[PDB]
Amino acid sequence: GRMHAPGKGLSQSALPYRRSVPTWLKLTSDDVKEQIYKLAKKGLTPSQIGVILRDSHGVAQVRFVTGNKILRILKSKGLAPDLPEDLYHLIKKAVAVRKHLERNRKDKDAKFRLILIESRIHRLARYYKTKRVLPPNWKYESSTASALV
Amino acid sequence: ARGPKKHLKRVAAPKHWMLDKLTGVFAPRPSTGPHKLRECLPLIIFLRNKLKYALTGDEVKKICMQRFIKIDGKVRADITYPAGFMDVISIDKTGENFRLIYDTKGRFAVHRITPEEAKYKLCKVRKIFVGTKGIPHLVTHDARTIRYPDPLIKMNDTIQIDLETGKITDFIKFDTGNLCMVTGGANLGRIGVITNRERHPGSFDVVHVKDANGNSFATRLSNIFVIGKGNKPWISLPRGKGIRLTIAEERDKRLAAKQSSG
Amino acid sequence: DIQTERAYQKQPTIFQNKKRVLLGETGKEKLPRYYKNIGLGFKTPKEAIEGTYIDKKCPFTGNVSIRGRILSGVVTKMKMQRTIVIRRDYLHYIRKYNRFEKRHKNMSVHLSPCFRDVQIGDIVTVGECRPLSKTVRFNVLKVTKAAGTKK
Amino acid sequence: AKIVKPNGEKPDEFESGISQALLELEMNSDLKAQLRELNITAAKEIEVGGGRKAIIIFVPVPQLKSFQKIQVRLVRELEKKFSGKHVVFIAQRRILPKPTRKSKQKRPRSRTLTAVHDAILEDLVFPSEIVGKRIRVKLDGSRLIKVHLDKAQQNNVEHKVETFSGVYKKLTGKDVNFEFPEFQL
Amino acid sequence: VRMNVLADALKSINNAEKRGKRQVLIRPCSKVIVRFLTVMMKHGYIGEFEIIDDHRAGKIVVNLTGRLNKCGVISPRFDVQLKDLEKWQNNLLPSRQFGFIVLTTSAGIMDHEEARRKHTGGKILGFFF
RNA sequence: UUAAAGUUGCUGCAGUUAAAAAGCUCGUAGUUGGAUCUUGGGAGCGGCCGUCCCCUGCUCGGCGCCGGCCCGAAGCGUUUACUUUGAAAAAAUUAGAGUGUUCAAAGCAGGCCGCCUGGAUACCGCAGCUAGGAAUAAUGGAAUAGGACCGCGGUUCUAUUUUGUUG
């Protein structure tokens, strides 16, 4: 089940057993490398790069062709984002929720959802501190929310 | 307790003193001497329980200060004198001498010896000291300070001293391949050969001793008395030669002796 | 950097005022350093050899010996000077409920300035000494870094 | 010559003969456009079960990706130059011991025994890639592995499955049976 | 979420044995599960059991027969000694003529009589009879 | 006061209605955490298997020989819990061996005609010390290459066996 919801949904991907590049693919590893470089220079999430590649380029999985995933390529080239994308989206959602609440005082369930997403932000920040990705002195607070990217 | 103890209860005595319960409240606390309290044997205990020469505590005193018993060549008039390992005791008038060796079990045993073997005594060196004007010194396990020793006597060797002059005659070096026996612990009186000697820095250095029939055991460094150079022992061993018969072979031997005796 | 307090700090084994032939240069002004091997398979570090700190409770350059028990722990706090507190986490067993419990008994050990590359979480080992203070009995023999800290 | 070796020892007469045959094959054909830098490490002839034999070529791993587009014609030229012996390209890989508490960096998972055995099994069947795999455990405690392949490229592979089973039995020691199910395509 | 895969596998095969079916779909895979099922096969309780290879997690299909009474798990893993094991087979086995206790050993996953004759012991796993 | 009490429930209790799920949710300390890493082989006995041996590297030497081989060793080898062995762990007491206190509770005595003995053994929770294995559970190796390896290239402090006796 979800960590903040009573739902028990089962909807996700299903990777095939066959571990081989397709023969009909005409995109070499180099060509998808500057494809990923151009899509990252356009300012996109790596998941957006993956969905764009899988739709408009016919590649099944990048790590089955190149040999590594998108964030490894972006870190090896030197254009990966400083903050991870899911925690950045959670921060932006928290800023949107707070800009709703300090404009609209009387709503309560939105404050409940704000508490839930703040707990999610805290747990993901604790995991990133444990994995030594975030700095150990990093701390999220509301008073520097909109000033933060 | 504001001072040293002077009494000793009967059930607080060591087990190798080999007493009973329903005789008296107290036990003979030995006078201070060369040997420790739990590792020695009083003269009253030997003369009243082992040799059966006396029955009460006054008869032992009469025999003791009658000037009849000589301890390592010196006459002693203390009934609670500590007698320990290889303490040569002699009776001059009836011509008997005893050597105190631990037997196959955890106790002392009576062992009559010839007078020619009663003239010397094997004893273990404890530590090496340097005196005032550059005199090397030896401290022996029965607290015999000997001046000017042989230069090849090390920390854990065994020297042989004539009881009439106090000097060193011959020695045994601490090495593998020498006949050894243990003084204290779970193993006591077993005669064996040193094979291994494991060195642990900052703690007890255990050794490994193999018996003459195929048994092996491990004891500490302080629980070592070297008695021979090879296979031949330098002293007369007691009965059984210290083989530590197990309970099955002991039962079989006792049953065979009972069947043969009838 | 040195000679902070109201008395001179020196090592009372060496003589620091030997009279040379010249009392000028080229052979002087390099004072000898007193050090010893503490034993138990431990190796003295270079910081105790070429350092300039002065101690009386250091296991290498000092008047304290190492004997007894060898323990280990994790460094928790570095607040009081020249000595630190470590944490020993151990498991205790109950005969009735056949299940363990973890316990901690923190206690203060002595850190010489020889080991100054110490942060919170570093694993250290200690050796038993004579009482150096009211609650300090142990001296640190070596330091081991924790995970990460690759800088 | 054509053959090189990571070990500093002279190659034997059989692998030198295979190297000379490969050099002749690229000499009198158009293979020289794709074999200027590509070479051979080792060769071995082993008794495949029955009256027919086969040869095994040890190839370095980074050269097998170059060979992966080339095996369409080399194999058929190798049975046509020989009498009837099949040729199998098995990549060489190093099997490292497990780092125990007795016996330096991390041994990667790619060099582990299971990984190199699965990679040998994958490189064993080049035109028919892996679509299914089952393991049978009989009453004797032994493991009978089974390999299921696709319904594409059957007629050129189905006469060499016993050769693959024999060389996998000799190289590893595991009984592997090959089957062609008709499931997806 | 899931803690022990052996507990779920043993509960699933016990339920499918009580309902009287012949094939059981064990969805996790583990070395201890394969070794436990191998011990049960070697002591004549099951038949041909499968290992379905997959790049996610293997699945085990067993050939049941009308031979198993109950197989279970002792959670958490209790360590035993050689003298301590006698109380465990006193209060866990239904009889002394049959039944087995599988316990973890440095020699491998292996039952209690063999661990007795090899003079060893370790953490417990489960039981079957 | 103990057993009966499975009426304190770790083994081993109950929580819809008999006593008892906080109104609901987040959350720190605590407790519990998925798969995955060396498989398989050989010399042979009883006739494929229940017992036998084999799959960590380096500075000095005794079991043997003709500067060349094996054996051993001053000294080092990723750390834990778990598991088996070893040391030590006072006696009495608890089991327990011997012994016709007339039996027994006892006690460590006693039996042949000066002789022969016994006065054992096990247990001693845990914690500290040691030696074979790493299956089980948790940590760490390198991703900013301040990663291994190989032979080269620059900067310093110190050792008597020597530039004809001696400075």
Q: Which residue has the tokens 């899931």?
A: E2
Q: Closest Cα to residue D50, out of D174, D183, D163?
A: D163
Q: For residues B55 and B47, is the Cβ–Cβ distance under 8 A?
A: no
Query: Which of E48, E68, E88 is where one domain is finished?
Result: E68
Q: For residues B124 and B140, is the Cβ–Cβ distance under 8 A?
A: yes
Rg (chain B; Cα; Å): 20
Measured between beta carbons, the chain D residues lying within 8 angstroms of A20 are: 129
Specify whether E47 is located in the same domain as E77.
no
Q: Give the SS3 label for residue D130.
A: strand
* Contacts with E, A 15-34, CB within 8 Å: 15, 17, 19
DSSP 8-state class, residue E8: H
Q: How many CB atoms lie within 10 A of CB A85?
A: 15
First to last CA, chain B: 57
Structure tokens at A126: 């604790």
Å from E119 (CA) to F99 (C1')? 38
CA distance E90 to E96: 8
**Strand F within 7 A of E126 CB:** no
What kind and span of H or E run contains B123? strand B120-130
Å from C54 (CA) to F135 (C1')? 52
Q: Identify whether C113 is preceded by a cis peptide bond (ω within 30 of 0).
A: no
Contacts of B among chains (3+ CB pairs under 8 A)? C
- Report the Cα E36 to chain-centroid distance in Å: 4
The alpha helices in E19-94, defined as continuous H runs, are 31-42, 85-91
What kind and span of H or E run contains B260? helix B247-261
Q: CB within 8 A of A74, min separation 6: which ones?
A: A36, A40, A46, A80, A81
Dump the DSSP string for B4-62. -----BSTTS-GGG---STT-SB--PPPS-SS-STT-B-HHHIIIIIS---SSHHHHHH
Q: Give the SS3 label for residue A61.
A: coil
Specify whether E2 is located in the same domain as E53.
yes
Rg (chain D; Cα; Å): 18
Structure tokens at B64: 């003791």
CA distance A100 to E31: 53
Specify whether E77 is located in the same domain as E50.
no
DSSP 8-state class, residue A130: H
CA distance A134 to C126: 34
Sign of CA dihedral A99, A102, A107, A109: positive
CA distance D34 to B170: 89
Nearest-Cα distance to chain E for A142, in Å, is 33
CA distance A3 to A117: 11
Q: For residues E13 and E28, is the Cβ–Cβ distance under 8 A?
A: no
Specify whether E5 is located in the same domain as E33.
yes
Q: Which nucleotide in the DNA or RNA is closest to residue E5, CA to C1'?
A: F34
Q: Closest Cα to residue D30, out of D83, D74, D86?
A: D74
- Report the Cα C10 to chain-centroid distance in Å: 18
Assign 3-class secondary structure to A47-113.
HHHHHHHHHHCCCCCCCCCCCCCHHHHHHHHCCCCCCCHHHHHHHHHHHHHHHHHCCCCCCCHHHHH
Closest residue, chain A, to E1 (C-alpha) = A1
- Report the Cα B20 to chain-centroid distance in Å: 22
Contacts across the B-C interface (CB distance below 8 Å)? 6
Please state the domain extents for chain C: 1-151
Name the residue with the least CA to C1' distance from nucleotide F37: D98
Q: Report the length, in residues, of chain B.
A: 262
Specify whether E46 is located in the same domain as E92.
no
**Strand F within 7 A of B49 CB:** yes
Tell me the CA distances in angstroms from D8 to C79, D11, D17, D37, D41, one per residue in order: 61, 9, 19, 20, 12
**Strand F within 7 A of B25 CB:** no
Å from E120 (CA) to F84 (C1')? 6
CA distance D44 to D56: 5
CA distance B70 to E84: 57
User: Are D136 and E52 within 8 A, CB to CB?
Assistant: no
Q: Which residue has the tokens 């006792």?
A: B254
Q: Closest Cα to residue D88, out of D108, D71, D102, D104?
A: D71
User: How many domains are contained in chain E?
Assistant: 2
Q: For residues C54 and C9, is the Cβ–Cβ distance under 8 A?
A: yes
| Resolution for the entry shown, Å | 3.7
Sheet of B191-197, strand order: B216-219, B207-211, B191-197, B179-181, B225-226
Query: Which of E39, E68, E97 is where one domain is finished?
Result: E68
Measured between beta carbons, the chain D residues lying within 8 angstroms of A25 are: none
Q: Report the length, in residues, of chain E.
A: 129
Q: For residues D16 and D3, is the Cβ–Cβ distance under 8 A?
A: yes
User: Are B201 and C41 within 8 A, CB to CB?
Assistant: yes
Specify whether E36 is located in the same domain as E80.
no
Q: For residues B87 and B56, is the Cβ–Cβ distance under 8 A?
A: no
**Strand F within 7 A of E42 CB:** no
Q: CB within 8 A of B224, min separation 6: which ones?
A: B124, B156, B180, B182, B183, B207
Nearest-Cα distance to chain E for A17, in Å, is 7
For E50, the closest of D135, D139, D141 (CB atoms) is D135
Dump the DSSP string for C9-72. ---TTS-S----SSSSSSS-S----------TT----THHHH-----SB-SSSBS----S-EEE
Specify whether E100 is located in the same domain as E114.
yes
Q: Report the length, in residues, of chain D.
A: 185
Tell me the CA distances in angstroms from A146 to A97, A116, A143, B153, one per residue in order: 12, 19, 8, 86
For residue E24, the enclosing domain spans: 1-68
Sign of CA dihedral A139, A143, A144, A145: positive
Question: What values do phi and psi take at B175, rounded to 5?
Answer: -160, 160
Residues 141-160 of D with CB under 7 A from strand F: 141, 143
CA distance D62 to D156: 26
List residues bridging with D130 in a β-sheet: D149
Q: For residues B144 and B185, is the Cβ–Cβ distance under 8 A?
A: no
Q: How many CB atoms lie within 10 A of CB A90?
A: 18
Å from E70 (CA) to F9 (C1')? 25
Maximum pairwise Cα distance, chain E:
43
**Strand F within 7 A of B22 CB:** yes
User: Are E50 and D141 within 8 A, CB to CB?
Assistant: no
Angle (CA) A69 A74 A76, round 5°:
95
Q: Report the length, in residues, of chain A.
A: 149
Question: What values do phi and psi take at B121, rounded to 5?
Answer: -155, 125
**Strand F within 7 A of A123 CB:** yes
**Strand F within 7 A of D94 CB:** no
Q: Which residue has the tokens 């254009």?
A: A79
Q: Which nucleotide in the DNA or RNA is closest to residue A76, CA to C1'?
A: F143
Name the residue with the least CA to C1' distance from nucleotide F57: D103
Query: Which of E38, E68, E98 is where one domain is finished?
Result: E68
CA distance A10 to E19: 28
Structure tokens at C123: 């694993």
Specify whether E37 is located in the same domain as E98.
no
Q: Which nucleotide in the DNA or RNA is closest to residue B10, CA to C1'?
A: F91
Query: Do strands D54-59 and D86-91 pair parallel, antiparallel, or not at all (unpaired)?
Result: parallel
A148: left (phi over 0), alpha (psi -120 to 50) or beta: beta
DSSP 8-state class, residue A22: -
Q: For residues B192 and B205, is the Cβ–Cβ distance under 8 A?
A: no
- If 0-12 CB within 10 Å is exposed, 13-18 middle and 19+ buried, where does residue B64 land? buried
CA distance D160 to A85: 51
